[PDB]
Amino acid sequence: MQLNATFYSGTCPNASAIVRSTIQQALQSDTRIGASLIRLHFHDCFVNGCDASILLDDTGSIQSEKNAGPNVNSARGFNVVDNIKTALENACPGVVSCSDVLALASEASVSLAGGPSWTVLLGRRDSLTANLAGANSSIPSPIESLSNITFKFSAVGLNTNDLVALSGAHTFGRARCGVFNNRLFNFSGTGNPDPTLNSTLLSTLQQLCPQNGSASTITNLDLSTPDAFDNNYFANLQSNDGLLQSDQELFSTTGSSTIAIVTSFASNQTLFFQAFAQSMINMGNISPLTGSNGEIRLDCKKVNGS
Ligand code: HEM
Ligand SMILES: [Ca+2]
Ligand SMILES: [Ca+2]
Ligand SMILES: [Mg+2]
Numbered sequence: 001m002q003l004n005a006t007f008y009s010g011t012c013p014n015a016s017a018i019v020r021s022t023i024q025q026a027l028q029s030d031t032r033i034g035a036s037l038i039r040l041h042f043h044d045c046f047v048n049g050c051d052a053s054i055l056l057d058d059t060g061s062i063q064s065e066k067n068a069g070p071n072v073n074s075a076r077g078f079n080v081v082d083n084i085k086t087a088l089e090n091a092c093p094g095v096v097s098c099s100d101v102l103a104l105a106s107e108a109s110v111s112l113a114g115g116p117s118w119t120v121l122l123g124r125r126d127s128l129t130a131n132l133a134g135a136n137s138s139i140p141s142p143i144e145s146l147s148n149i150t151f152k153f154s155a156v157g158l159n160t161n162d163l164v165a166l167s168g169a170h171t172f173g174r175a176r177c178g179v180f181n182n183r184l185f186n187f188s189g190t191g192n193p194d195p196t197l198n199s200t201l202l203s204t205l206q207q208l209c210p211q212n213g214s215a216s217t218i219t220n221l222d223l224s225t226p227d228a229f230d231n232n233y234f235a236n237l238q239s240n241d242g243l244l245q246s247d248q249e250l251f252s253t254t255g256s257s258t259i260a261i262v263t264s265f266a267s268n269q270t271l272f273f274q275a276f277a278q279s280m281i282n283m284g285n286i287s288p289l290t291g292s293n294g295e296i297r298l299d300c301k302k303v304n305g306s
Contacts, residue, residue, distance in 0.1 A: 001290040007122035012092035020108040034109030035173030036077035041102040049287025051127040052098035068135030098300035099124035115229030118277035125294025142244040164261040165275040170221040171233035178215030196252040198240035234266035
């Protein structure tokens with residue numbers, strides 16, 4: 001079956017408002033939570049489709065994706081997903097899937113932060129299983145080459161236009177020293193820092209992230225506007241201020257089609273927002289469970305009846 005915008009119209013007509021209100025409240029005590037929630041939809045959709053597989057906790061039969069590399073000591077906001085789900089169950093018992101919660105939460109989080117709105121497609125059902133191993137092989141790493149990140153997007157059905165647009169989600173949220181410290185001292189065995197990192201930002205990060213220091217310390221992905229959803233992410237790349245290798249590679253890779261897409265988005269926020277919305281719908285359409293497949297989870301952490 002197809003996902004559609006009006007799936008909950010007759011059963012939980014206020015779902016969008018409930019999700020948005022809940023995240024607005026969460027934002028008052030955690031300005032990062034919107035960023036964290038949209039990343040959960042990304043890590044969901046990239047493994048066994050947008051099926052809420054990532055939300056399942058370990059059991060005797062389930063090996064949770066929360067311990068997959070990209071998620072461990074990194075993914076967050078699971079409690080807030082639970083609170084969104086509780087609010088929906090209070091209003092609309094048994095109706096909204098956890099998979100749809102993550103799609104709805106992504107749009108709310110982006111719009112609340114000053115980003116675009118878009119028409120969320122709905123009707124996804126929740127998996128009965130998790131895929132930790134697939135998370136380890138399917139989700140791109142910040143130190144991968146542009147060609148290998150591109151390959152991982154293509155394997156789930158997103159193209160280069162989608163990659164550059166969706167990378168703009170790094171306009172908000174945080175990253176730890178450990179996922180960019182290879183840039184700072186001895187980049188790829190060369191004995192020198194990554195030359196595509198601005199020397200000013202370099203010295204700031206060397207002090208934040210000393211060689212013998214903690215890899216868990218965080219900074220902002222977007223030093224311009226850390227919590228605001230805007231095109232500043234792309235402007236940063238133009239001044240060698242992207243934080244991850246995978247960020248800066250979009251602009252600094254010689255002869256890459258991605259350079260012009262970066263400059264389009266830096267030059268025109270409307271074009272960025274239009275592309276971002278379309279690419280989020282594209283990502284949200286990856287391998288949904290529909291009809292009899294999957295279930296509607298009561299509690300996003302566990303399968304029904306368990
Ligand atoms: C293009 C390939 C991508 C790579 C290599 C990548 C990598 C990462 C890494 C390494 C972090 C830092 C994790 C931390 O240290 O705890 C991060 C954070 C984040 N990513 Fe990405 N990412 C990618 C694409 C995306 C996409 C497609 C989205 C959503 C549309 C997304 C949304 C975010 C957000 C919002 C955060 C901040 C999360 C938070 O503060 O809790 N990323 N990403
Ligand atoms: Ca999934
Ligand atoms: Ca920003
Ligand atoms: Mg600038």
